[PDB]
Amino acid sequence: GDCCIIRVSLDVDNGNMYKSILVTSQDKAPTVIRKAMDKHNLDEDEPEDYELLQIISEDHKLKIPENANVFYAMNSAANYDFILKKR
Amino acid sequence: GDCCIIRVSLDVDNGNMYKSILVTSQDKAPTVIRKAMDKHNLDEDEPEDYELLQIISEDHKLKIPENANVFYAMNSAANYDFILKKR
């Protein structure tokens, strides 16, 4: 079935360190945050502590809604670069 | 970037054995066919001896052109079921 491979960094003071993950057509925001937290060894806590944002440009980050399908809520015309932001 | 998880079987000894491959936007037929033949253990022949072959419906099959990007040459509106065939 359908997929996309995205880049996820932590929310950090200037840009920086992306870890790649596989997003299926079925993946909602908490599963993709759990995958992104595993790529960064976040036994420094829970998927509820975290929101996900897409980097549209320097002046725009796109907020992924709490239980949304990531594959269809993302802007797939923009670059696949995301923040794992600790809310 | 974008991708699909595709499963491939053989045209040969009549019981349907699937193997999954991850196909990216950049993947060409002979390279995904290479992966499929290694996954089925096809070791007498070269990747040029073989075509792919998406099952569009019963009575209907799609030939992926020999040097084409599988991701954009396949029927994305259909079953992600492929068989590997001689010629």
The domain ranges of chain A are 1-87
Neighbouring C-beta atoms of residue A82, cutoff 10 Å: 25
| Residues A63 and A53: beta-carbon distance below 8 Å | yes
CA neighbor of B79 nearest in space, from A1, A38, A42: A1
Q: 3-state DSSP: chain A helix, strand, coil percent, rounded to 5?
A: 20, 40, 40
Method for this entry:
X-ray
Question: Could you tell me the resolution of this structure in angstroms?
Answer: 2.4
Report yes or no: B12 at the A interface, CB cutoff 8 Å.
no
**C-alpha distance from A13 to closest chain B C-alpha (Å):** 26
Cα dist from B69 to A12, A78, B27, B80, whole Å: 37, 22, 5, 15
| CATH assignment, A1-87 | 3.10.20.90
Angle at B28 between CA B21 and CA A24, to 5 degrees: 40
Nearest C-alpha in A relative to B22: A3
